[PDB]
Design an enzyme around this catalytic site. Sequence first.
Site, PDB file in Angstrom:
ATOM      1  N   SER A  29     -34.156   6.827   6.136  1.00  0.00           N
ATOM      2  CA  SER A  29     -35.224   5.895   6.524  1.00  0.00           C
ATOM      3  C   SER A  29     -34.844   4.494   6.043  1.00  0.00           C
ATOM      4  CB  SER A  29     -36.551   6.294   5.862  1.00  0.00           C
ATOM      5  OG  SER A  29     -37.657   5.858   6.615  1.00  0.00           O
ATOM      6  N   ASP A 155     -21.375   2.417   8.338  1.00  0.00           N
ATOM      7  CA  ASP A 155     -21.180   3.866   8.190  1.00  0.00           C
ATOM      8  C   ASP A 155     -19.851   4.549   8.498  1.00  0.00           C
ATOM      9  OD1 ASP A 155     -23.958   3.470   7.812  1.00  0.00           O
ATOM     10  OD2 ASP A 155     -23.920   5.670   7.736  1.00  0.00           O
TER      11      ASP A 155
HETATM   12  C1  LIG Z   1     -19.646   2.155   4.527  1.00  0.00           C
HETATM   13  C2  LIG Z   1     -18.147   1.950   4.593  1.00  0.00           C
HETATM   14  C3  LIG Z   1     -17.590   2.019   6.010  1.00  0.00           C
HETATM   15  C4  LIG Z   1     -17.410   3.467   6.432  1.00  0.00           C
HETATM   16  C5  LIG Z   1     -16.110   4.062   5.905  1.00  0.00           C
HETATM   17  C6  LIG Z   1     -16.302   5.518   5.506  1.00  0.00           C
HETATM   18  C7  LIG Z   1     -16.399   6.430   6.726  1.00  0.00           C
HETATM   19  C8  LIG Z   1     -17.571   7.400   6.626  1.00  0.00           C
HETATM   20  O1  LIG Z   1     -17.083   8.734   6.485  1.00  0.00           O
HETATM   21  C9  LIG Z   1     -17.004   9.429   7.732  1.00  0.00           C
HETATM   22  O2  LIG Z   1     -18.320   9.898   8.075  1.00  0.00           O
HETATM   23  C10 LIG Z   1     -18.671  11.261   8.364  1.00  0.00           C
HETATM   24  C11 LIG Z   1     -19.913  11.621   7.541  1.00  0.00           C
HETATM   25  O3  LIG Z   1     -20.921  12.156   8.385  1.00  0.00           O
HETATM   26  C12 LIG Z   1     -17.574  12.333   8.254  1.00  0.00           C
HETATM   27  O4  LIG Z   1     -17.482  12.975   9.522  1.00  0.00           O
HETATM   28  C13 LIG Z   1     -16.151  11.917   7.872  1.00  0.00           C
HETATM   29  O5  LIG Z   1     -15.784  12.626   6.691  1.00  0.00           O
HETATM   30  C14 LIG Z   1     -15.861  10.437   7.622  1.00  0.00           C
HETATM   31  O6  LIG Z   1     -14.891  10.028   8.572  1.00  0.00           O
END
Ligand SMILES: CCCCCCCCO[C@@H]1O[C@H](CO)[C@@H](O)[C@H](O)[C@H]1O
Length: 324
Positions: A29, A155
């Site tokens: 959230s 992400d």
């Molecule tokens: C916040 C920093 C930028 C993002 C870099 C890290 C990448 C996130 O991690 C990713 O996300 C997924 C989690 O659901 C997984 O499938 C994988 O392990 C990974 O590639």
Amino acid sequence: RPTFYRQELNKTIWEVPERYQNLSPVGGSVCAAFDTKTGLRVAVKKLSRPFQSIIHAKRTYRELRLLKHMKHENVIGLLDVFTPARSLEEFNDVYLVTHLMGADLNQKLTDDHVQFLIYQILRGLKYIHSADIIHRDLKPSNLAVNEDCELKILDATRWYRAPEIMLNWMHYNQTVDIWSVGCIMAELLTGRTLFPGTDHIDQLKLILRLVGTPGAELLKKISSESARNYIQSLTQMPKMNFANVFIGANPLAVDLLEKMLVLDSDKRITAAQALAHAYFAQYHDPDDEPVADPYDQSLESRDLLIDEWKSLTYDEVISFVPPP
Ligand SMILES: CCCCCCCCO[C@@H]1O[C@H](CO)[C@@H](O)[C@H](O)[C@H]1O
Ligand SMILES: CCCCCCCCO[C@@H]1O[C@H](CO)[C@@H](O)[C@H](O)[C@H]1O
Ligand SMILES: CCCCCCCCO[C@@H]1O[C@H](CO)[C@@H](O)[C@H](O)[C@H]1O
């Protein structure tokens, strides 16, 4: 310890430091807020059920550790992390604070703007990759921009996914992310999705249409007998002329695209190589394309008890030091 205040929000009680004012649901959230200490508009994410199970707890620890590690201008970072708990025994909730990013990349852009945006993605990806991390889901919605067009990587569409991920290959190399960058760059240049597949197999069909079917060098690297047999049952087709797919584009853009969107992942350009490509001449600066400290992903991937994950997560909260 800051003074906290309580207020019902997104239908749950949020308890946050008073520095964060005027929380408003933007949909765990996330709520936008104004950080009075820094003068920043921020996103405050209250994790949902962070320690409900071993899987929740392991996910929470991974998310917090990753965000704490990322310290780069083109990667989202952690401004703050807090809990109202005064001890481990009271610890139930975790809140993560980041820059509130008002816009993302999700009808064509000028070539000068594509240079600037892709430069920043690659600069951020150089850093992520240097930590031995693969993003694996780069797409326009994971690319935030501000009003000065400064970009951060953040992400479920399949339009940007490397073909080897689409085939559940494993052994993924970091250039799965370069495939995604190529797809994004193409779309910024043309204003059209490069590979708008309708379902899983249609995505692969569209990819093969552009890049051609596997050559002998690539076939030699395929361990799967079924894949090998399917590929050699296929009708051989040539790679399309990228110049005609991207009519009127900067020749340096087309060249770079040809170097990203190669079927064989071993032959794709890396983020660091791409930053040195002539397309980015007006931005490239070796003195300021930094790499990351090593990140140990094995600390995830343990099989621990809930209270162990919870305690480790608590420690990461207590040890947090804010950025300048
Ligand atoms: C916040 C920093 C930028 C993002 C870099 C890290 C990448 C996130 O991690 C990713 O996300 C997924 C989690 O659901 C997984 O499938 C994988 O392990 C990974 O590639
Ligand atoms: C690396 C090789 C990937 C294996 C692809 C598995 C089969 C692909 O899909 C198949 O191919 C045909 C053409 O789309 C169709 O008749 C069928 O829908 C489907 O069974
Ligand atoms: C017909 C569909 C064929 C899809 C071919 C995808 C080939 C991707 O490239 C491959 O990916 C792997 C993962 O890093 C590697 O281990 C290989 O060395 C590499 O050739």
